Every structure is written in structure tokens, then in C-alpha cells.
């Protein structure tokens, strides 16, 4: 198991513009297009992202290309962030994947907002961090996915995904 396979299980794959759990226009493997309500603003973002007139539909390769970019940006976002980097550096490889998953889903700003949990992760207080991570809108809104991520943090293994 790896970050790509992990995120592909959590996000799924859709070749047509769809709405995410929050109601925003997305495509591919969890690629957010726009928070705007306009499907046209979504089609426009999409064409801009792909470099062609898509009419809201993309190929598997196109989906994968967006996905490769998004994982790369997520890692680089972590490494550039003063609050995130120290945590990331302190973690083992499996747990690193869990933090990348949170950032891909909620952005660097969002994760950086989990101040107390980040501190507990840095100190390697697994059980306590897992408890604190659960007291969030994140867990409340997407509980099955949050549990998987959280279990990865708690255990340091890929069990939740197997
Ligand atoms: Cl893009
Ligand atoms: Cl969920």
C-alpha cells in the first residue's frame, strides 16, 4: 500500500464532473474544481486545468495526471509550511502518508489548524492524538474516511485499508 493507492480508495474515480460531500464541483480522483455554484464556472476551470475543451468529461489518463499533480502539491505544501514540516519530519513513513491524506482533503491551512493534535503527533502520543483528532467537524462530516485516517495515525500500519 502507498499514498496513491490509499487516496484512490478514499476518493474514488469519476470521469464526469460531480459534486463532493460538501456540494462542490469535483472531477477525477478528488480534484476540487471550484467552490462556486456555477457548473459553467466548473467547466471553465476544468478546461483550464486540462488544456482542452472537455465538455465536463475527462479520460482516465487525464484523471491520473491531475492526481499526480495534486499529491505532489500536497507533499510540497507540507514541506513549505512552518507548522507542518516539523511534524511530518518527525513521523514514520506510514504516518506520513496519513498526514498527506488529510492535507489533500482539507488543504494545508485546515490541517495546520489542528494545533493540539499536531503537538500530540509530534510527541508520539498516538492514542491521545486519535482521541483529539475525532473532536472535529472533519470526523463528524466524513466519519468512515476520518476513522481510517485516524487508525493509520494510531497504529502506524495500513490495517484500515486492508
Ligand atoms: Cl490545476
Ligand atoms: Cl466518510
Swiss-Prot record:
GO biological process: cell wall macromolecule catabolic process; defense response to bacterium; peptidoglycan catabolic process; viral release from host cell by cytolysis
EC code: 3.2.1.17
Cell compartment(s), UniProt: Host cytoplasm
Outcome (variant: residue 11 to Q): Complete loss of activity
Result of altering residue 132 to M/F: 2-fold decrease in enzymatic activity
Recorded superkingdom: Viruses
Enzyme class: hydrolase
Protein role: Endolysin with lysozyme activity that degrades host peptidoglycans and participates with the holin and spanin proteins in the sequential events which lead to the programmed host cell lysis releasing the mature viral particles. Once the holin has permeabilized the host cell membrane, the endolysin can reach the periplasm and break down the peptidoglycan layer.
Protein family: Belongs to the glycosyl hydrolase 24 family.
Record's protein name: Endolysin
Protein species of origin: Enterobacteria phage T4 (Bacteriophage T4)
Amino acid at each position: 500500500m502507498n499514498i496513491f493507492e490509499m487516496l484512490r480508495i478514499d476518493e474514488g474515480l469519476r470521469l464526469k464532473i460531480y459534486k463532493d460531500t460538501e456540494g462542490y464541483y469535483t472531477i477525477g480522483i478528488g480534484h476540487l474544481l471550484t467552490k462556486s455554484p456555477s457548473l459553467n464556472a466548473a467547466k471553465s476551470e476544468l478546461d483550464k486545468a486540462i488544456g482542452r475543451n472537455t465538455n465536463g468529461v475527462i479520460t482516465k489518463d487525464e484523471a491520473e495526471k491531475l492526481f499526480n499533480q495534486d499529491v505532489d502539491a500536497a507533499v510540497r505544501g507540507i514541506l513549505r509550511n512552518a507548522k507542518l514540516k516539523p511534524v511530518y519530519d518527525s513521523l514514520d513513513a506510514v504516518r506520513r502518508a496519513a498526514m498527506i491524506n488529510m492535507v489533500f482533503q482539507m488543504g494545508e491551512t485546515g490541517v495546520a489548524g489542528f494545533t493540539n493534535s499536531l503537538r500530540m503527533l509530534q510527541q508520539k502520543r498516538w492514542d491521545e492524538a486519535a482521541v483529539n483528532l475525532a473532536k472535529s467537524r472533519w470526523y463528524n462530516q466524513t466519519p468512515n474516511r476520518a476513522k481510517r485516517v485516524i487508525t493509520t495515525f494510531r497504529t502506524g500500519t495500513w490495517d484500515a485499508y486492508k
